[PDB]
Amino acid sequence: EVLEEIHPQDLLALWDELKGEHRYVVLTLLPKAKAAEVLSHLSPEEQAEYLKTLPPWRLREILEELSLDDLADALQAVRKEDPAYFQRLKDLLDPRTRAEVEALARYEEDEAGGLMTPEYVAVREGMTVEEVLRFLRRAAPDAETIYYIYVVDEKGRLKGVLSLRDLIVADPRTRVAEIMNPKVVYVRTDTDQEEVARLMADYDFTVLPVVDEEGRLVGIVTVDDVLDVLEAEATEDIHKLGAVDVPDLVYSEAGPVALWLARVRWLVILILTGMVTSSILQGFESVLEAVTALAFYVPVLLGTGGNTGNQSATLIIRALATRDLDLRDWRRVFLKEMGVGLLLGLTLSFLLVGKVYWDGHPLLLPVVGVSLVLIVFFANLVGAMLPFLLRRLGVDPALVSNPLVATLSDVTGLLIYLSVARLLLEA
Amino acid sequence: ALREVLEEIHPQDLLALWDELKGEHRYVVLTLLPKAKAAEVLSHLSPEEQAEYLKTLPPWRLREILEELSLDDLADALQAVRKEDPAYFQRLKDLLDPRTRAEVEALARYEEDEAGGLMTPEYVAVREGMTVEEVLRFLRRAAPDAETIYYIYVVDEKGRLKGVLSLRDLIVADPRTRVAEIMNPKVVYVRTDTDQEEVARLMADYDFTVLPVVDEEGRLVGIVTVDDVLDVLEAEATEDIHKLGAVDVPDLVYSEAGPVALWLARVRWLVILILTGMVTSSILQGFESVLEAVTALAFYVPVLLGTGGNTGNQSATLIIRALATRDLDLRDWRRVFLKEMGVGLLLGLTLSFLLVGKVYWDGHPLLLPVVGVSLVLIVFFANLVGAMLPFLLRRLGVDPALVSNPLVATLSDVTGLLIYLSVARLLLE
Ligand SMILES: [Mg+2]
Ligand SMILES: [Mg+2]
Ligand SMILES: [Mg+2]
Ligand SMILES: [Mg+2]
Ligand SMILES: [Mg+2]
Ligand SMILES: [Mg+2]
Ligand SMILES: [Mg+2]
Ligand SMILES: [Mg+2]
Ligand SMILES: [Mg+2]
Ligand SMILES: [Mg+2]
Ligand SMILES: [Mg+2]
Ligand SMILES: [Mg+2]
Ligand SMILES: [Mg+2]
Numbered sequence A: 001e002v003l004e005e006i007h008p009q010d011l012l013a014l015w016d017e018l019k020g021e022h023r024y025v026v027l028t029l030l031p032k033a034k035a036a037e038v039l040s041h042l043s044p045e046e047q048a049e050y051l052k053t054l055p056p057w058r059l060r061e062i063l064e065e066l067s068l069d070d071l072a073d074a075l076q077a078v079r080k081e082d083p084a085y086f087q088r089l090k091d092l093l094d095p096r097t098r099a100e101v102e103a104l105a106r107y108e109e110d111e112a113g114g115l116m117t118p119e120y121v122a123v124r125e126g127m128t129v130e131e132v133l134r135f136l137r138r139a140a141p142d143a144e145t146i147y148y149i150y151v152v153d154e155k156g157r158l159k160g161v162l163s164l165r166d167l168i169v170a171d172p173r174t175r176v177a178e179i180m181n182p183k184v185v186y187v188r189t190d191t192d193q194e195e196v197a198r199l200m201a202d203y204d205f206t207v208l209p210v211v212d213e214e215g216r217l218v219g220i221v222t223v224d225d226v227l228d229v230l231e232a233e234a235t236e237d238i239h240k241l242g243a244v245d246v247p248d249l250v251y252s253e254a255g256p257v258a259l260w261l262a263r264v265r266w267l268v269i270l271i272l273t274g275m276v277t278s279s280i281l282q283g284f285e286s287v288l289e290a291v292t293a294l295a296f297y298v299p300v301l302l303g304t305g306g307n308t309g310n311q312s313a314t315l316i317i318r319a320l321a322t323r324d325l326d327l328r329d330w331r332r333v334f335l336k337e338m339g340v341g342l343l344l345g346l347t348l349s350f351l352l353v354g355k356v357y358w359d360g361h362p363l364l365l366p367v368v369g370v371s372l373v374l375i376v377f378f379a380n381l382v383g384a385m386l387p388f389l390l391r392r393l394g395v396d397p398a399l400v401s402n403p404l405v406a407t408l409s410d411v412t413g414l415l416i417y418l419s420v421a422r423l424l425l426e427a
Numbered sequence B: 001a002l003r004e005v006l007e008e009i010h011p012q013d014l015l016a017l018w019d020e021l022k023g024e025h026r027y028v029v030l031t032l033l034p035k036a037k038a039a040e041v042l043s044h045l046s047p048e049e050q051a052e053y054l055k056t057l058p059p060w061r062l063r064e065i066l067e068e069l070s071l072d073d074l075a076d077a078l079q080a081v082r083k084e085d086p087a088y089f090q091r092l093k094d095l096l097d098p099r100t101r102a103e104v105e106a107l108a109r110y111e112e113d114e115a116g117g118l119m120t121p122e123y124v125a126v127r128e129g130m131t132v133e134e135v136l137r138f139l140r141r142a143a144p145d146a147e148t149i150y151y152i153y154v155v156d157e158k159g160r161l162k163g164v165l166s167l168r169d170l171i172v173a174d175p176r177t178r179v180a181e182i183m184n185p186k187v188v189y190v191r192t193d194t195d196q197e198e199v200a201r202l203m204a205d206y207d208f209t210v211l212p213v214v215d216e217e218g219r220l221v222g223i224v225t226v227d228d229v230l231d232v233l234e235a236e237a238t239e240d241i242h243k244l245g246a247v248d249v250p251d252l253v254y255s256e257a258g259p260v261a262l263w264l265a266r267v268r269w270l271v272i273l274i275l276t277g278m279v280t281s282s283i284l285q286g287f288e289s290v291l292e293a294v295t296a297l298a299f300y301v302p303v304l305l306g307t308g309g310n311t312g313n314q315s316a317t318l319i320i321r322a323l324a325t326r327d328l329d330l331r332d333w334r335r336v337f338l339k340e341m342g343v344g345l346l347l348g349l350t351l352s353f354l355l356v357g358k359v360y361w362d363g364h365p366l367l368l369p370v371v372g373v374s375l376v377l378i379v380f381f382a383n384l385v386g387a388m389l390p391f392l393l394r395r396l397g398v399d400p401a402l403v404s405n406p407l408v409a410t411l412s413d414v415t416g417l418l419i420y421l422s423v424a425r426l427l428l429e
Helices: A008-017 A020-029 A032-038 A044-053 A056-065 A068-080 A083-089 A095-105 A129-142 A164-169 A193-203 A223-241 A256-283 A285-290 A298-321 A327-359 A365-383 A386-393 A402-426 B011-016 B025-032 B035-044 B047-056 B059-067 B071-084 B086-095 B100-108 B132-140 B196-205 B226-242 B259-277 B279-285 B301-324 B333-361 B369-395 B405-420
Strands: A120-123 A145-152 A158-163 A207-211 A217-222 B123-126 B148-155 B161-166 B210-214 B222-225
Touching: A008 A032, A008 B196, A020 A032, A020 A044, A020 A056, A032 A056, A044 A068, A068 A083, A068 A095, A120 A129, A120 A217, A129 A145, A129 A164, A145 A164, A145 A207, A145 A217, A158 A164, A158 A207, A164 B132, A164 B148, A193 A207, A193 A223, A193 B011, A193 B226, A217 A223, A223 A298, A223 B196, A223 B226, A223 B301, A256 A285, A256 A402, A256 B301, A256 B333, A285 A402, A298 A327, A298 A365, A298 A386, A298 A402, A298 B226, A298 B259, A298 B279, A298 B301, A298 B405, A327 A365, A327 A386, A327 B259, A327 B279, A365 A402, A386 A402, A402 B301, A402 B405, B011 B035, B025 B035, B025 B047, B035 B047, B035 B059, B035 B071, B047 B059, B047 B071, B047 B086, B059 B086, B071 B086, B071 B100, B086 B100, B123 B132, B132 B148, B148 B210, B148 B222, B161 B210, B196 B210, B196 B226, B222 B226, B259 B279, B259 B405, B279 B405, B301 B333, B301 B369, B301 B405, B333 B369, B369 B405
Parallel strands: A120 A145, B123 B148
Antiparallel strands: A145 A158, A207 A217, B148 B161, B210 B222
16 A cells, blocks of 8 residues: 555654654564665664664664665764664674675764765776666666766776766767766865865766775765755854854754753853953943943943954855855955944944933043944954964864854953043043 | 867866956956856856856857856846846847747746746656657657756646656666656655745755756646755855844855945844844943942943853754754744753853852952842843744744844843843842
8 A cells, every 4th residue: 555655755754743662663664675764864863772672683674775874874873872782783784784884984974985885886997888888787776876987997096987878878889988087076085074065066966986095986975965964064053153062963852961061161161251351341440430421331332342243253254164265365354344344333333322422421422432433343353354363273263153252352342442431531 | 278278177177266366367268268168157156247247248258158058047147137237138138049048038937046946947858658768769869958867757748747767767677668667656846936945955855866846737847956956055054154143135245245245234233233232221321320339240241241142142043053954843942941941040050150259259259149140040041032032033934043143142131231230239229
């Protein structure tokens, strides 16, 4: 009936609203291949969960009908968690497969090796269209994709790439060398997870040839896997903006005690800094005593500082991740972003000055005013160079979180504001 | 030597060197490049740059380029001119051949960020009254003018959709077997009015490299590729990011946007926020009768306000993302309200013990509860605020990525004070 009608995705989507037991049985019941595709797009936590529960026959079932790059991710899940059971889990496989998966684990999850599958179709050099097809057909059953064929040499090293679209349009008796493409865009096995995703997206590829530390083709990567990178890349970037520093943190799958350990770290760095603010206020207590109104404006003043700093740091952290801007550009961003703050100040001061005034304090109006078009100015430039600097230091500009740029706009905002008051008090 | 040492060079190599090329060099290269490469270069540029070169480049190279360009891509570069110069748009569809300009008229009509927007009519389609032999025979004669022959879609006498074939299959199958034998009626499709982002959700789930597009009747009018849905994924996300930092412009390309442009982008939410924060000025002066008695009090206002503002930024992000990743149900808010409730108290305490430490050491033992106790009540509240704000903002029908960090702080001031200056109105009397 429907045991062949339902798609894995159907069961995936409703997984979010399915009882664990029911979910469990649907792993024993489905076809081998469908049972494997489901346990394939589950959270690494649930994966290692069902690999423990499911029976030893349905276990070896999944482990076989599962892709090799996918299998590694799943075993690596168990490895991290229950390591004892990991080695046992890895016992169910056969010699050739285990020694295949084993080689994948030794690659960094975040690099090419940790993203590639060995099931790629690669022919030797001097065959023909018609031969390559007969090969493809014979190799197809176990390949990940036969849509791109890689031409290696007698030492295993990439020498060309072949489109199945090409073989299909070509006289079968034409030698592939004269239709394959020699400039094989590729990545190494250390190549970064994100470094791949760019290439994939850049050249419009759907498959990418990973060569080993020695140019020998050793696996391929598929875009559908890069999609998952991308999303997890951006998810990390966003998480790094709001100042949470767990790259692999899923909200629903994480408790209080764990949410504590994740957020508390940056709130203790930032408040140590934000303390400099109290001290800074005390230093200017003569000026805070004389004219009382000065403090009445610290919030709206200091805060419109951090908002400005956010926007520009935000606007720049991404141009860097999006490769829209490079480190060689700072000295130009400065100019542009500098005449942008000045303008952003003029605008926002003309607005606050009106409040200061209507507030009933027409005397410290220039103080407040001139203090904005000096805060909005530097707040800007700061957020607009903190990432640029972290790059030149070899650091993740995403660490230039919005909170960090805000806490740092306080230490500065006061120093600007108060220091400009104490100067105006002299007159 | 211009069409030689350069003849080889990849349009991508050329693209990477783009920002490093003058507004005059990018022109002569754009006018010299083999017609094919030139259009691949124009192809990925920004609507603003394209529409520049589709005007300044000579009428001939204009013709060449215009034509040797993917259909869905042509449609874009067209619309990119419709906005800037509605005039040139239709004097430029004159460089087109009645057939090419046909699919285009029908393509622009669709919304840029809808399914129909990113789709192309260069899909291969067939009838069930066929056999593997003929589909292959048919592919061969239809391939050079298609986007992809790896996926074949079968239609009926009227044009509706009926199933999908993977070329992989048409190569492991026997040439004599029927076509409706190996196809799939379980064919997942997408409406023409479907959302740019929702499309990229499917194609990401189903590990699809292609997706069909129907109208309100189930016909087949085009397809969408994952190469184009890849860029989308970036956009939607990299726009979500701008929407965190109170920048609110669609496809903002900083590298190409000048002062006025950026000014136009950032000013709107700066204003909104400043005269939202002004509420703290009047909050301060409706409380100067309390502030006057204790000097040592305002010394801490920043450390107290700009902490909960960070706290609110954290809870906010996680939830906002946990929403856009489809991770959190709109009906998980009661579960988050209860969850975060304890973390913000557990965060509050660990943080107070630190501030109280300084408040004391600082030289103001006068009374730490007035400060330390306020801190807990702010870190508690602000947290629960940045959490439920993206929640509420959804049920109303609004992009929860609008609960931008700046907004969360600005809003956490107007609340931070009220809490603090009340624990100093009570703890004082
Ligand atoms: Mg990384
Ligand atoms: Mg891996
Ligand atoms: Mg692309
Ligand atoms: Mg293309
Ligand atoms: Mg894969
Ligand atoms: Mg990053
Ligand atoms: Mg949208
Ligand atoms: Mg489009
Ligand atoms: Mg996927
Ligand atoms: Mg798969
Ligand atoms: Mg396309
Ligand atoms: Mg969005
Ligand atoms: Mg603040």
